[PDB]
Structures are given as C-alpha cells and as structure tokens.
Amino acid sequence: LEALFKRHFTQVEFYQGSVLNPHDLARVKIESADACLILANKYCADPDAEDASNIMRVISIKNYHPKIRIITQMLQYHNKAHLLNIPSWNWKEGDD
Amino acid sequence: VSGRKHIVVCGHITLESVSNFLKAFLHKARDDVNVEIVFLHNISPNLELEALFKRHFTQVEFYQGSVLNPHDLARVKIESADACLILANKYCADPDAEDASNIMRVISIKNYHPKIRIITQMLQYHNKAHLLNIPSWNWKEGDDAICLAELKLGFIAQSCLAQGLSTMLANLFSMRSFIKIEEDTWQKYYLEGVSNEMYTEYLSSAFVGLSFPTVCELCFVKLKLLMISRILINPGNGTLGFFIASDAKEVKRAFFYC
Amino acid sequence: MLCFGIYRLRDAHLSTPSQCTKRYVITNPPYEFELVPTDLIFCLMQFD
Amino acid sequence: GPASFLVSLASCLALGSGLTACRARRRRLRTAALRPP
Amino acid sequence: ETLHNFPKVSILPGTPLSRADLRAVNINLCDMCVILSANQNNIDDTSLQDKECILASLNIKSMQFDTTGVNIPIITELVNDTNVQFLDQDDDDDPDTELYLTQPFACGTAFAVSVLDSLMSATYFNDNILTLIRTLVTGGATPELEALIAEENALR
C-alpha cells in the first residue's frame, strides 16, 4: 500500500486516525472537504455488523460537520432506512 | 499502626479502577483523611500502576495475595482493618459470574473475621439478596452493598418523574471543587451548581425543639444551608439532619447554632 | 415544598432569541439568585 | 563514618520532631481561632 | 415474572427503532422515553459498542408529527462515557472533556454507571448518605421490605 501511495505521489495522501475521533477529523480538515466517501467491506462475514459500523461512521462525521456530502456503500435495505433516519442526513444536498 | 486506621481494597483492581478510586477517596475537597489504603490483588501491577502507587507513597500500599486465602488476609491485617471495600467489574461479559465471585469474596472475608465492615458492589438484585442471606452479614453494623443496576434504574425512574434529577443526584454525591467561569455561559451556572455536596450533622437542642419547616427555613436564611431510626424525607407538621452545602465547614455551624 | 434547584433553559441567559428546548439543572441556588420566568423547579409534595 | 551517620540521623529526627510539633501547635491555634467570630 | 403485580403495564412486541411502533404508542405525547440495552455488556470494542442506543435516540429526534421530535424527553443509558458526544448535534464534542461537563449529561438526557463508583467513597465516610440515596430513588425501600423480597423473591 505504501508503494501504491508512492505511485500516486501528488494525488493521494494517507493519514492514521479514527473516524470516531473528532481530533482525527480535524487533522484531515474534513470541515473544508468537498465530500466524504465511506468504503464498505462487501465480502464481510456479518453484513449487519459492517452496516452498523458504516452508520456509526456517518453519525460521527455528521456530528463533527453536519454540512458535508457523504457517499457511502450499504449492504442491507433496512440499514439504509436507518441511515436516512439520521437527523442530519438529507438527500437533496448530495448525500447518497 | 496505633491511631492510624486502614482499609483493605480487593476485587477488580486495574489501572483505571484504582485511579478513579484514589481520585474519589483522597480528594482535595475531602477533609484531611487519616486512613491507609491497602490493596490486595493476585496479579502483579503494571508499570503504570506501580508509578501510580509510587505517587501515593505514604497513603497507598499494595500486597500480592488472594482474598480466598486466609494467609493473605492475615498478611494485610484484616482483623484490625477499619473496613474492606470490594470493587466489582461493572463492564463484565456476564454479571452473574462477577456477582458470584463477589459473593465468594464476601463469604471468605466474613469467614476469616466476621466482625469487619464490608462495602461491596453488585450488578443484580437477586445477588444482593443472596448476600443479604449470609449469616455473618448484618446491615445494622455497617455492611453495605451498592447495587449498580438497582441504583441506576431508580435514578432513571426518578428522572422520568422530574426530568434532570438523575444528574442532580449524581453531581450531589460526587466530590468536586469550586470552579468560576468568567464567560457568561450555561457552563458557569452549571459549575456553580455542581459544587454542592451532601453531609450529615447533629442538630442543636433548639432545632430539635421546633418544627421541621421552621428549622429548615431558619437554616436556609441564616446558616445558608439547605436541610433535606427511620429516614424521613422532608416531613410535615439529638437528631441527624441531611444538608446540601459546598463543604462540610458550612454544615458544621448547624450544630453550633445558638 | 422543599426546593432543591431549578431546571433552566440553556439559552435563557442569552439575549439572542432561539428555539432551543434543552435545559440544564442548577442545584441549590443562592438566596439572591436571579430568576427567569421560563423555569421548572424541583420540589417535594407532602401528600399521599 | 558511624559517628557522622548517627549525627545526621539525630539531626534529621530532631528537625522533623520540631517541625511536626510546630505544625501541631499551628493546627491547634487555627482550630481554636475558628470558633469565635 | 417479576412485573405481573404492577398495574398499568403494557408490552409492545417489535423493534424499538421502527417508526411505526413508536408512533403507535404516541411517543410524542409521553413524559419520558427510556432507551435501555440488555446485551450492551457483551459487545466489547467501542467501534461496535452502543450503536443501537445512539441510533434510536437520533431516530426519535428526527421524527416529525402533524411538531418535531427534538422536544421529546429522552434519557439514554451508556456504557462508554465517550459515546455521549453523539447524543446531541449542537454541543462542542471533545474526548478530553469528562462526562459531567458534557451537555447531554448536564441536561439529564444521558446516564452511565461510571458516575456511581464514587458512591463507595461516600459510603465509607457516611453510610447515612447511601441509605438516604436508596430511600429517595426507590420510594421508601424499607429494610423489612428488603427481607420480604429476599424471602419470597416477589411482592406480596
């Protein structure tokens, strides 16, 4: 992965931190970010647990900055409905 | 040591648990204490725990032993111990195992010296009843069992009655200090409020002579104290009275009132 | 009625109007504590 | 060697005893001065 | 088995997070909604801890009634003291700020067992404090009642 990052030297940056930690979000300057893309583990043993973790990440990001576009991958429909149940999640401004 | 009391602390002994216990016990706002805290655990402390014990050099001692072993109880001088505080693992996988282990610890301690006072923690009510069924365990001499689930559900139910009472009580029985906030925010008023602890004091003869509302308002207006075999909560119509005040120094004047 | 404290609006002290509903608790206010009409007061009833 | 060590031990013990006696006296006076207004 | 002797108790079988179930019981017209988790101790790992309580709190806060759901009185139990920052979207979250200065705790909308541990210290210095706390939250839990509930394991 370090070699892959070095290949895209001027386009890709990497940082170590947690989405649940507001200090880490402040480090990556997520308040000025155009969007926040949340990848998902498609081949996960428990899809419900992965969906819950993704929902938790979305909750944390919206808690820090509630005016950022978030594009996420979801594995189940009911978890998607729960995601749309979030107070700060709105599809009109680009949240998908 | 003659004149120096000591208490034996056992059970769930970790870095965070011991740090919290020492923060709550040897508090600056707390009056000058004269007791020694003797920890007894079967696992040797880490480097961080060793440093924490080194910071409290003259107030905290550690001895490696098992509560179930009577020899270890004899080593920590549990016969002369003022009390034994048994800590519990509230964040356990299953409360049944932790509660059963606490039952066994209490059984062993009461087996060694049945006249000692024990303060313990519980996660279930039926385990508290099982503790209450122990022969040597009697609640009149000082034995207590703080039930976490029972107390938390009582706090939640009271908050359902008046919203915000749970945090009131939680800040009320927790030892804190005085903080002044220059900025005119809600935090300033909240920190002004949180600085009140709860104390008990014997009322004077004149206070006993009069009625409860009269002495309560007299304490509030003159002494500036809010005064809250059975415990009577704000009755209608010598004795121990429960006060809410910034520190015990203000409570002490209730006994000295003329 | 024995009153412990008050349950004051979070934005009560602010001059700028707001629609916030959350309130914070104040325990044992002093005798000369300034009081706001939009308040709830914890207290006790002596009646079965 | 032993003479100097005993001298240091006695000096430290005497200093500690004097300081703790002074502290006890100060505590007694400051507790007695609290009762009267 | 321990609740059949109490009047005015009803049970709604279903997910506590579904909006239809909460609308049926008229969650807007209620004195308090208490979100409790039973198997919250099993889940070990903060990245996988207290999902349901926070998600349900946000779901109830996001409801719309023909008024909005942010005025519903809610109290939530938590086991991780750092998860209190996700309960409210208006406060300034900080992992360094301790629990009792956090806005949900100051407003009485959150609770955790980590604040009761200090009781032990108080219980050592004044057991009257513990008995006053017990007799204030449970509504006069007398020790004879404790013995009775220890014998029959029920209420007579």
Place this chain on the structure above:
Amino acid sequence: PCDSRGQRMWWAFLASSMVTFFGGLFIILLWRTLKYLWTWMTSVKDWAGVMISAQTLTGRVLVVLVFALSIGALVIYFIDSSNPIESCQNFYKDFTLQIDMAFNVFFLLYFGLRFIAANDKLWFWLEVNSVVDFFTVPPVFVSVYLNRSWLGLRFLRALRLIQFSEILQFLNILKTSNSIKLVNLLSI
C-alpha cells in the same frame, strides 16, 4: 610545592566504610534479637515519607537537588579519576574538594531522612542506594581529615543513576509504560 606521592595507605577509607556498614547491620540485628521474646514517631515518619516523595514543593525541590547532585558527583568522580589513584591534596587549595564536601553532606542528610522514612530498617540497610551511601561519604570525610586522597570505591557513585526512573516518577514526569521501561533500561 606540588610534590609527589610516596607511602601507600588505603585501609583507612575501606575500614571506615566497612565499620559504617557492618556495625549498623549488627546493631539492627541485636535490636531485633533483643526485641524477640524480650531476650510522635509515626508523625515524623510520615513527614519524612512525604518529604522523600515529591508530595510537597519542598519535596520536589529535594528530589531535583538529589538528581542534580548525583549527576555532579558522577562528574566529580570522572575528574578525580583523571588524577592519580593515590595522591595528597590539601583541603583549602583545590576547589573540587569543597564541592565534594557539600555533595557528600547533602547525600548524608538525604540518607538520614530516607532512613527516618523507611518502613523496615534492616531491609533499608541492604539497599543499593544505602550501600553506595555507606561506601562513598565516610571515605570522603576520612580523606578531607587526613589531607590525602585515594581513588577508592568512588565508582559506586555511578550506581546512583539507577534511582533516576523513580525520581522522575515522583515528579509526575513519567506516566506511560513504554517511557518508564525505556528510562529504567537506559539508567540500569
């Protein structure tokens, strides 16, 4: 006028150190045997214990002084090791010996305070810090008395570097496990 060294005597310093150690050990053992089947002290002990740890501002001052003066004593040992093993040096001329005098006086007072604060006197006697205090200060006093210097067991001053980790822990400087382990390993 800057003469040389001649007769060689070294049993004075070593004998003084051995007396200071073994006599105290024998007195402690004799007291224990006498107490065995008869064959305010707590206050001053607690005060000394509070003094030893950085509990009070004066405690932190004493701890920092112990650190600095142990380092200085090691440096003075280096400087003296640059000199011949056995030499004659008058007290009033060389400025090194007065500094060593002050350092050893401070270390002797610190040892006395630690003994006052100690729980078990016998086990305190058999301590590395106490031992290096036994074999360093009496030799310095004998040397300043006899106006002659021998490079005796002065390397034991380096053994004062072991207590650095505990010294830093008292001052609330080391808190984490990794830093504590690193300091312990480096000092040892």
